[PDB]
Nucleic acid binder design. Sequence first.
DNA 1: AGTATGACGAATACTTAAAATCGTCATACT
DNA 2: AGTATGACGATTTTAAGTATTCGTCATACT
Lengths: 131, 131, 131, 131
Amino acid sequence: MQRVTITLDDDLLETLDSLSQRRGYNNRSEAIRDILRSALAQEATQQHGTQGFAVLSYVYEHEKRDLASRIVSTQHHHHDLSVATLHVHINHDDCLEIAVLKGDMGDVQHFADDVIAQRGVRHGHLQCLPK
Amino acid sequence: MQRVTITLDDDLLETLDSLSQRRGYNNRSEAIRDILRSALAQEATQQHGTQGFAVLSYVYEHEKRDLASRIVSTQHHHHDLSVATLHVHINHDDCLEIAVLKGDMGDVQHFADDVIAQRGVRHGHLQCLPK
Amino acid sequence: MQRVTITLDDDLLETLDSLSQRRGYNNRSEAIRDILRSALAQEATQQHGTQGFAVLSYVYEHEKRDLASRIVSTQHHHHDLSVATLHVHINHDDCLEIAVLKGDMGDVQHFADDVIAQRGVRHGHLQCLPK
Amino acid sequence: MQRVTITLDDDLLETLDSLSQRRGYNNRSEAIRDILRSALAQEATQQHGTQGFAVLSYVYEHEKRDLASRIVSTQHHHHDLSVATLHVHINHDDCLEIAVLKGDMGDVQHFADDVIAQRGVRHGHLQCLPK
DNA sequence: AGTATGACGAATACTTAAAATCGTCATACT
DNA sequence: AGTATGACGATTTTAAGTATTCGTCATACT
Ligand SMILES: [K+]
Ligand SMILES: [K+]
Ligand SMILES: [K+]
Ligand SMILES: [K+]
Ligand SMILES: [K+]
Ligand code: NI
Ligand code: NI
Ligand code: NI
Ligand code: NI
């Protein structure tokens, strides 16, 4: 098999290990392998063509890599694809934005990842509602 | 923080890396992490004790007398969970409502149900975001 | 850009400078500007062909079965002037709605009126932001 | 009397002068004096006591003065007076934000100023709805 | 009185350089 | 297989410094 080195926040790591231990896992590699495999398999994306509405929601640290200042530009670039976005400051560092999108379910998907992917933007998620 | 090495079958890794490039993160580490945090969260939102946030999105028509009226009511019902609610008038008689909620994941789920029910609520979807 | 000097009575200036420090701007120039744009943009809305954005806010009781799903219907009549509408649930029966509107300042003021009307809408206010 | 030099955008200055001319004003200093005096005198501050809800709404170039990330930062500083904020991208450069505030009408008022005073935040406006 | 401008400390925008983190591999001990 | 690290380029943070653009007061013209 292949080796791979990932880098995790201390908290993430603990949260992960313990939870892997309470499940009967004696080795991380298995543990993680099962999750990747699982969540990876149960996947699906948006067919390019249909139009409609989408609801992109996600959390992120506004401090990390001028994410706040950046996320906006990211959107203003396709400002003809954003209806509005609702923000909710959940604490000094973290933020929970919810963006309503409208247009080519394709462009949407893009713009979505143009966000979600960013390092320091956890729990990304795009929900679609095509005409 | 922390850095770890795991081992996964040549097969899986390929599947993972496809995702890395295919959908955004040209970073294997993040890809994993985001999939790791998905995991922890699921098996945290469906765990006794957890509190947090949540994004309940749904559609419905403003043409039914016993549809648009109830929603708001049954929502004020537990107005201690509703942070706010963005609403869009997609077309002439259809509404796209997104409601951000906050509290014990339990009640929250409950609260979501008592909303997706009210006949006329289509595509109802809950997205939990623990602490 | 442009820089100008004006002359005002010792009296007035003192009143202005109190405002500068008292309420934010520790900058005389801005203080003035903001007050100047209030003036202009005011006698800019009450005019012809004037188009732009507007923020219609108001409160009401959802308890009244003819007030809850009553506002949404009116808004759906001008679903072409509505962008989105944020809504909060102050308490068991109080609603705080904010409707962001775009279009011609006429139809808007119109629209607003209709919504300010529907008996039971208190504190109703509309702010215009011409282009 | 006292001399004072303010700095204005070219457009602002023209918009202002012409409008001052169409009103029978032969000198700017009078024109401006009258507006300052008026709107200034016609104020309405908030006392540190009454709690309630507020509706702060403004526009601002997100690239100017790092506003996008600063605004956020400041709000996260008073992240307890903030319920939720609705953003709307009107164009590549400008943004229309609507923050719904809650708490001691006095702090709100303060906070609101910590947003409106900013060079780069035009048409700022606070609307109060106490208890 | 009402308008323009010079002059210059203060605030903000651009560049540029060094320091601290992250993302992957590869080697090495369990 | 699993897990832990050194090594090292790519990505971000900080710090630093210079060119601009502001905000006001002072001086001078209209
Ligand atoms: K991410
Ligand atoms: K609430
Ligand atoms: K609409
Ligand atoms: K908050
Ligand atoms: K301002
Ligand atoms: Ni925030
Ligand atoms: Ni609607
Ligand atoms: Ni309500
Ligand atoms: Ni914007």
